[PDB]
Amino acid sequence: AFAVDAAKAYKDYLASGGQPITNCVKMLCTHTGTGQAITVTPEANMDQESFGGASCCLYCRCHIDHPNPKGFCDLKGKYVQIPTTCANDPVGFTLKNTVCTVCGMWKGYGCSC
Amino acid sequence: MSSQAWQPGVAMPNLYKMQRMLLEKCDLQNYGDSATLPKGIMMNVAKYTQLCQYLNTLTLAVPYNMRVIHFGAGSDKGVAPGTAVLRQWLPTGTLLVDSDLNDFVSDADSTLIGDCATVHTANKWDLIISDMYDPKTKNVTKENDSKEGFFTYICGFIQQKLALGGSVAIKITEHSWNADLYKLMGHFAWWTAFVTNVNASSSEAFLIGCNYLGKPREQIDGYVMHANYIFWRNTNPIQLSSYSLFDMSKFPLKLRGTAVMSLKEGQINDMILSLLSKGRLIIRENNRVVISSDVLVN
Numbered sequence: 001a002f003a004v005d006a007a008k009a010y011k012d013y014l015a016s017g018g019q020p021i022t023n024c025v026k027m028l029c030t031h032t033g034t035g036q037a038i039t040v041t042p043e044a045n046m047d048q049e050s051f052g053g054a055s056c057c058l059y060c061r062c063h064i065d066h067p068n069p070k071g072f073c074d075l076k077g078k079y080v081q082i083p084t085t086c087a088n089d090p091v092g093f094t095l096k097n098t099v100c101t102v103c104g105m106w107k108g109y110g111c112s113c
Numbered sequence: 114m115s116s117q118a119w120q121p122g123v124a125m126p127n128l129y130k131m132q133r134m135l136l137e138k139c140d141l142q143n144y145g146d147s148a149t150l151p152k153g154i155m156m157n158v159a160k161y162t163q164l165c166q167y168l169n170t171l172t173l174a175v176p177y178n179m180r181v182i183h184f185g186a187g188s189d190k191g192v193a194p195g196t197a198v199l200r201q202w203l204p205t206g207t208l209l210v211d212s213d214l215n216d217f218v219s220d221a222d223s224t225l226i227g228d229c230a231t232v233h234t235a236n237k238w239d240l241i242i243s244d245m246y247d248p249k250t251k252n253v254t255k256e257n258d259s260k261e262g263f264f265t266y267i268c269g270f271i272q273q274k275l276a277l278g279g280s281v282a283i284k285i286t287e288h289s290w291n292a293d294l295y296k297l298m299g300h301f302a303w304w305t306a307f308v309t310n311v312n313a314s315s316s317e318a319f320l321i322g323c324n325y326l327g328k329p330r331e332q333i334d335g336y337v338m339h340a341n342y343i344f345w346r347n348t349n350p351i352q353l354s355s356y357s358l359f360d361m362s363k364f365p366l367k368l369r370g371t372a373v374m375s376l377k378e379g380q381i382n383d384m385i386l387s388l389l390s391k392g393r394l395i396i397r398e399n400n401r402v403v404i405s406s407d408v409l410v411n
């Protein structure tokens with residue numbers, strides 16, 4: 001009945017004043033993109049930075065299983081748009097936030113739904 | 114010079130390829146200088162981008178369901194920056210396989226960990242990329258001789274596993290280079306040594322074969338040609354430039370939908386060779402992609 005919870009582990013590590021995960025891969029792009037949360041190609045707009053998905057995935061970076069029966073990773077192989085203000089910790093961001101299903105944007109950032 | 118600063122990098126001029134030079138020590142004038150990269154951008158992301166920006170100017174077969182393999186994909190940071198750029202650069206739906214000696218996290222469709230010599234694939238490939246570098250190369254102990262190890266694997270992999278019309282980009286330096294790989298460049302419709310503007314202060318270059326013909330159209334001495342390359346680098350200072358990184362508008366690889374055709378080696382003729390050389394044709398099997406990595410038990 002035991003499973004390690006990494007999500008909480010990192011959040012508390014952050015709250016403890018720990019240095020966020022680094023060396024997430026930032027992509028060169030136009031920053032004219034659609035601004036959607038997770039995409040096949042960097043979509044960052046003026047307010048966003050675009051990163052390689054895998055490097056922003058906590059479970060990928062920590063070499064641990066992904067939290068779902070399939071063990072599927074919705075980040076790796078794709079690109080994630082992080083608000084430029086939050087870009088110092090892309091892993092923390094993707095962890096704490098949520099993607100709007102209908103408009104494909106980040107809920108709370110750029111989602112008018 | 115300095116006109117090139119607005120390019121992604123500089124390619125070795127044809128005239129330098131035709132010389133016969135003795136190998137000398139490479140001493141660069143810009144050694145120690147650094148280009149100013151955009152805020153928060155890694156050198157290797159910038160490097161791979163300019164490489165792709167240059168590749169965009171060549172004639173590359175770009176078939177549907179393109180097959181691309183990437184050697185030396187992992188960093189010491191445990192991620193794969195170069196793979197991410199290739200991923201961005203290549204058409205969506207392109208199969209991207211990458212590999213490295215050490216464990217790393219990748220955005221590639223599949224990743225193999227181990228010495229490249231342990232890697233086997235059933236099918237052939239449209240594009241081959243290698244950043245592999247031996248850390249022991251930094252030892253200046255002996256003189257500069259043709260290198261083996263992964264270089265021996267690459268030459269073999271090209272001859273066996275590269276589709277006709279395919280292209281390669283292989284990273285070399287002053288001391289990391291191989292003679293047969295140069296010789297193998299004459300088996301391509303065209304070839305060059307490309308130096309990125311961001312890394313221009315380094316002896317690093319990418320050997321780019323273009324449109325593999327499977328047989329030599331040109332005879333090349335590997336030792337002579339590498340001496341030619343060093344001579345070019347020695348006499349032509351390149352100004353470090355991050356300029357081309359700022360326009361990504363045209364960056365994505367244009368999808369040519371190049372034709373793929375399975376032919377026996379006897380069915381190949383000057384008309385076919387013509388098509389290959391123009392990057393209008395790929396010759397290989399269309400089957401599923403199956404790879405493996407040999408594991409030693411003891």
Ligand SMILES: N#Cc1cn([C@@H]2O[C@H](CSCC[C@H](N)C(=O)O)[C@@H](O)[C@H]2O)c2ncnc(N)c12
Nearest residue numbers: 157185187188194195214228229244245246247
């Ligand atoms: N000899 C040798 C070998 C050295 N490598 C790898 O080449 C890489 C050179 S640095 C690559 C930087 C990366 N492209 C990036 O995006 O940052 C290292 O990861 C090293 O592990 C090998 N892999 C497979 N077989 C080998 N024989 C070697």
Ligand SMILES: [Zn+2]
Nearest residue numbers: 057059060073
């Ligand atoms: Zn993941």
Ligand SMILES: [Zn+2]
Nearest residue numbers: 100103111113
């Ligand atoms: Zn919405």
